[model samples]
Target: SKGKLGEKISQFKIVEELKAKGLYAYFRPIQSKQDTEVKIDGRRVLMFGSNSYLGLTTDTRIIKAAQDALEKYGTGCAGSRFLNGTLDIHVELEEKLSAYVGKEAAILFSTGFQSNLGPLSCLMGRNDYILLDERDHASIIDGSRLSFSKVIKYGHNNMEDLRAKLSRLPEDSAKLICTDGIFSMEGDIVNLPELTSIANEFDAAVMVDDAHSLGVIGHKGAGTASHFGLNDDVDLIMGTFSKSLASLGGFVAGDADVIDFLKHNARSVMFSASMTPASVASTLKALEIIQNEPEHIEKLWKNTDYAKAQLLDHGFDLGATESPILPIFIRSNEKTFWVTKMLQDDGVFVNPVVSPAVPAEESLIRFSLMATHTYDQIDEAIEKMVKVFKQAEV
Candidate 1:
């Protein structure tokens, strides 16, 4: 330890202690492409825990698009989009993205975090209110902090609490309601219809973070708005390229004037390097495929429903999940870590979510699904999972 920061780092011992006990589940590396099944620790394991719901991460079309863009634009953009980083493909992608989300315009961010950061931080001025769900993503919380405005949080999906919070705010003042279209860990969908009605009742704008919903819901994965037939009612739609899009970028889509204002004022976009040409092209290709290939979306839902049903039949308590993200309620962090390690050793991959990310009693093993997973594969995974879960007794 060399400094005060070094001393602080030395005091963080819980993870290191867990590692010694062989219960730590973070940072396990995979040797192959992040597909339905991936090579981990020299063995191909069933990937029951990935966010790539449509299985396009290793798709041929997406790879070729990235390769073509890399050859044409070299490896990097080397500048912010506000400067010389705006490539021809960026504009092309934005046009398609605007249409994809049913928005009048769209703007890109280098990361999903920045997508929320830029739009949210810029939209809420002083004296305005930024209302969020308590379980909203970390990016949203950070974005709210960046804004010099009053912030209020309501219970997760509790419309009454949201309405009460809204009622307390000034009637004629600016207000925005931000929440996830799909809760990442719990897998429950937002009560968007009720939530939107509440927002309308207060004349507050609604912004849906479609990071988890875009590839998992709606006709052709058009996301929450499309899923609920509220596309016109949502004020803004924010999504990430890393999920269903199979790339690394972020975008916020809305009315042209609002997008234009964020494009100029969002500090993250003005300060950070733009999305690489390869990533932008790959995302564009992926979105095109998602829009055209209904089979992927259909198969994804089929697999999702099958897995959830099978898990329930096995007597595993899946807490309130209406989507592909399934959380097996283990109830304790220690058991969650133990069960996760056991599942990995038993030939299935899953993510262990613990306190801070979730409540203490809400610790669980998150099992996500993909379109490429076959019925047989799902069956095999379920068999292995059921067996190991019993042994772990969580």
Candidate 2:
């Protein structure tokens, strides 16, 4: 609020820090549609960023659903679900979401961010332990921070870390192990079976955030739990409509009682408006599409395997990716940003992910794969990536 030099000084200092590590990190606006090939500053570019893994954001059917709902119910819900925004459509969508995940009941939130925030903050107390992966998504980290529970990291798929932590506690400790169904960076599917085993042994309640895994994994798009056949083991499953469903908001599916408490007690849901009819309606249609076209999931992986194999064959390193989320680690903020910028110049749109999102040494280019990405597009992106990597001297 004082002189503007503080902001400029901080910005310049950050730039120096980034350059010292050989990275160029900054933001660039997206001016066009979530395109397969975008126009950045009037230049057409290829897009490998955004979690439009199923490419449903550009789906005509989903868009039409949103348009119809907007005409029928208007845009905003105008009040929290607890007060007046709990429309019939909200009830219908929650039921559908619960059924989709095979859970007894479900509750909706204004955003996936809120879905995590409200439930985690309301459900846990000081007596509980908030267990997390070292690399769980940022929302979970924030939720954990807001929580009164003692938050602990189990060190990224190391069941030993969970075992060691749990073993030290009393047998009756109430532990809530929250994890990303798929690790976003480096794209590793969590070892669900192993997590289940550990959760069961410790009597911990497990919550899987399927934000990336919902339509990206599972034979029928049931997500990480269904992918590993561990849905029965997971106590709560959270997912965002933004990604798989090509809509907005988020929901949590679980047993009836827990869902009931979260609906009545969660602060974010009780205070914030319920989801818009348009977003929820689009999600319903998107879910239907995902279910009818199980082939979409297969096609997505087929493209992923093809691209991954080609890149690996070219001697490029991919760190720990077992899914469509491919992280090409450059290890420097400047190189990561420079590589992304150059890739955009070469007609590809990818996101530069650096520290804060990931460890500083692990800064990378996060490229997501979409089911709708054509063979020619993938081939072009791979070629460009190879060239850009050389250009960036990685």
Candidate 3:
């Protein structure tokens, strides 16, 4: 007889069904470097599923920086930043991040998920309230759940709903408004100007998760706050290096006191080992590139516009995307999976967003752009994608 957990595991048959039908699309192994193109099963494919928006993962400058750091610092830290893990490069990177994001200070975590978990889990008290957009990332939701604060969710991107929720909270209570700078799945930007103004009216602090916004928006890719010119109004700005900085870590930037408090109090940062030297060095170099080289961002926008125009011309439904991340509505889970597999078979790579991630009727295929992708590559991907999509009748 199987135990309760074992019985539950045996009941999960969705993946098995999809696999039997040759439509299981999760976790396809890539044998080449992450770039405009990749190798899978010994075949080169145009990649549109990656999160490296600036396409800096293959830059020789960043690779060399990582190599130098590995030579100097070895592979691991063996201890947390609170102990023996603090390195000169870690401090330097934090400072650079703060200055770039226009914050008083910043602190790093081992991963982007931990970045949100660390701050949100420890910042608010039992009597305080944490406000969230209904569609914020899972990491943000998990962080709020870990805290003792009362978590209230508002309708997605609806300022009226947010204001109504805030109005019901006690006037003197400490309130924190947390929102994603860009809704990851929808690829639409948050209304920072209106949100910050509402926070001011309610006497609440605002935190923007710039995980998807960094290196994709703002002047020189400074992020959502800089894009709206409301840097001073936003209380905290959180970002991840894995997406655009071409490394594997995350950081939170804010006033000195809040950072100091999180450094000592946040369990994730205090308990976990600090970021490795190679990741820090590579991220630092990537940030430098973003600051000094304007062509990368310009090229990224050019490619984004070109791809969006072509996608629309083909009569594909892209739901309100303002960034490089474009979601093509398939409206059926079965067709989304089928189309994803067909696209890969035809030498194009894209990610499928199915039921539970979105409403069943709103399932989509996520198509993204990178700066290094050429016009011919986009044309090729669009042509191949159209053929597959039509065949699947999505």
Candidate 4:
């Protein structure tokens, strides 16, 4: 039979089936602003699903910065940076970000997704090789597809596998080694020191996606490379303003020449509207706060340690997590969903990851912690979760 649009739509009933059983947990709307606690349908829930690690999304200074930019530059940019959409704030933000990451230059994208996809796609064209971790972010995977380059996957954090694969690549081919500074799902730091050593041996360029690392690691939150004291060892550092910066854009930093080439050649940047003035302004302020207020980073880890310790004491399999992103292993998708619903009902919001996103047997709830979360709040969430876990019989 010839394919029909309705046929495809009809076959996609997994979510509907889950909904029927009252286990659906995607895209639930929040009635209030993102914070340590939020209102969902008139009930206050302690939020453990958000990625605002620094908790600056509701900060007064950052909010004021965006509001001022909104009043001064209007609401939108309406054009791409290749033409008229590039605001002065955009260039300013890029300059400040390059300095922040200790790179020669940087370029901004409308999103962290596009930031990786654009430069990565442009970097590896015909004959180039992209060596990736088996668990690299979806953005890195899509970027590899767009580049039309040969890709090789190495075992997660396995330097031996990386070396074995790199040995198999054509000796003369240009290779770009890419990895997430922190695995978003597993929450483990990449073996950057060893990975860099292997890349240097193979003469491959290294790119670190610090989407989850900035404001969460390193000296003064310079990210994964700085965390390892290998600032000059890495070649390209990419991060999003959405996480630590507490805004809605992304940037890739590298040598001036490479960035200049990407500035003009990257289709994602040239085709899409430039980031808004308010986002740029807010990110600038966020970056400033990140630099000046080290206490935020300190408090973030304090909460992270407490949450991780509490969850560990609860006897959940945390899966090599070394960052604030804690995965509570439930091992059953149905149970994961059930636990999620139960937790939400008990006023704790968490995200459930199931098959195709992770192994079917490894389905779990992603519980994130933020700096603004108090010890009392963590205790409240812990008590509710203990009850829910017992009810799930896990």
Candidate 5:
């Protein structure tokens, strides 16, 4: 399917450039659990690249819930949600999600990416205006392309840019402003209070895609709105089970009417089969645990503080980060790749970001921590990193 000669050549140009810069990368097989450490390529490595921030992905409760569901429901829903996949578990999960996020109601999609896609494609017709952040996620970018609205973009995390774009719109025109609760790659919290003010000033509905912040921020896992005390300010909240929860799907919390409309109108969600019984069960159980376990969030922050503080003391360039996601700037792409490789060789796992992942010469070692990663694991990782850096020249 990818045999278009022209397209292939264009891709080759990218591949060649990335390879030259030592950043051309591909998937690695993980053979062990997503715990404090994992096995990649049959080698032991510490984990610092997973999004399972709550450490619940491998939790016994979630794993068993999924296993029990598999026992009861087999493998698949076998039909689209619009037709035959609407199981009792599906409805129950949505209800729990809506209540948890403080929204009037909620809807679930087969994947987190589709959750954003389904809603954007269903809403905001040709007459509407859709505003986006310059640094929004790929799903948001693709969803905007599929929409009929006149898309406007603002500088990343810049309120002034947002206001400038919003100022041009007519007072009574319909509008939707979408942003990530925490910018995923950068791990910076959005200024939700300012965003709420801007939305109210412009009379536009607001939404936040919280793939990165749902379980990391907020009040014990309510997400960015709760973290910033703006729960009632935003009109829509979308979160995913793939990140903090130990499952694979996404959901949106919003007004009942909006959710109902999407349920009927969104082609993506309506046409796609609902989540499997195991997926739903795992996410439901994970949500319940998130609600009951505040210590998870606290431990996450405690580890975050310890690691980030050490990073700063070590004089690593962080590029204005303020979340669990941290980047160690390396001028030489070879050094960045070497750093990641060496860490994996030393029983630690991490990712290297370079080229199109950032800009040229802004490559980094992407390090993410979880609640389950203890001081010992962090210290080992840091020690390994320091030793490796000393052995190589950046």
Candidate 6:
């Protein structure tokens, strides 16, 4: 007798159906370092689906820093930051992050997902309201869900809609407006200046998740607020160390009092284990590199411009993309998956966004760029991608 859970699991056959047709594109293993090129199935494939915007994951300096930390501090922290897990490096990194983001204080989390979960979950009370952009990231959505505060979503990037939503809330009620600095899948940047202005009008505190914006925008890659010179206007700035930093962790920067409150009250921080020593060290080195070396950010933008031009030249429908993340709309679930498989087979890797994650008609292949990618590599990827897209009629 199969249990209810077992019966439900047994009926899930979409993966089997896709695999039968060789169009299954999930979880293809890579056998080499994360770089512009990676080894997949014994073939060197151009990596265009990575979030390592600065291409620092394989940098020897960062690796050496990680090794040094590991040698001195062992492997794990063994406890949450609230207890015995506090390390000197952790404090150092938090200070640097606060300064970099121009915030009065900052706090670290074990992971980017938890960074959101911790802050958003604890900041507001039952009587407060959280306003979200409809297309905000999953972590943001989940974080808000965990909060006792009422969550309201406005149309994606529509300031007027956001204003209207805020207008309906009681004027005396506490409100928080949360949005992504850059919408991850769509590759479009938030209207920070407009949004901050709206927050001011509505007496709402604004929080911008810079998960995809750090090392991709702003002065010295300081993120969304710095990009628009509105650092003082935005109330809180959240960022992750995994993407451009080439390590694992996340942080939230804001006023000293607010950070102190979260440091004490954020459950995810109080209960979860702290970040490993190696991740903190590597992230510290990566942050130093970003602040001191402008060449990485420069090359990233160069590659982004070159690739965007080539992609548009090939007549692909890229929807409102102003960053390195490019969404090449295929408009069909089957074709999106087919294109992902075809691109991988053709020695290029791309991520597919399909039904459930997106509507069927809005399905797309996500192509991204890294600072390490050469002009020739971009050319090769574009050539292969155009061939595959044409074959799939995407």
- Model 1 global lDDT (CA atoms, 0 to 1): 0.90
Candidate 1 accuracy as TM-score: 0.97
Report lDDT (CA) for all predictions: 0.90, 0.84, 0.93, 0.91, 0.85, 0.93
- Report clash pairs, candidate 4: none
Whole-model lDDT, model 5: 0.85
lDDT of 1 at 353: 86
Where does candidate 3 clash, by residue pair?
Answer: none
Q: How far off is model 4, as Cα RMSD?
A: 1.4
Runs with alpha carbons beyond 4 Å of true place in candidate 2: 1-12, 15-27, 356-360
Question: How many clashes in candidate 3?
Answer: 0
List pairs with backbone clashes in candidate 6: none
TM-score of each: 0.97, 0.93, 0.99, 0.98, 0.94, 0.98
**Candidate 5 lDDT tens digits, 198-222:** 9999888898999998888887688
lDDT of 1 by residue, 322-380 (tens): 89998889898878888888888878899888877778798988889999999998898
Worst 10 residues of 1 by lDDT: 385-394
Q: Could you tell which candidate, 1 or 6, scores higher by lDDT?
A: 6
lDDT of 6 by residue, 224-286 (tens): 999999999998999999999999999999999999999999998999999999999999999
- Clashing residue pairs in all predictions, respectively, total 0, 7, 0, 0, 4, 0
Q: Could you tell me the TM-score of candidate 6?
A: 0.98
Tell me how far the alpha carbon of residue 35 in candidate 1 is from the true structure, in angstroms, after superposition. 0.8
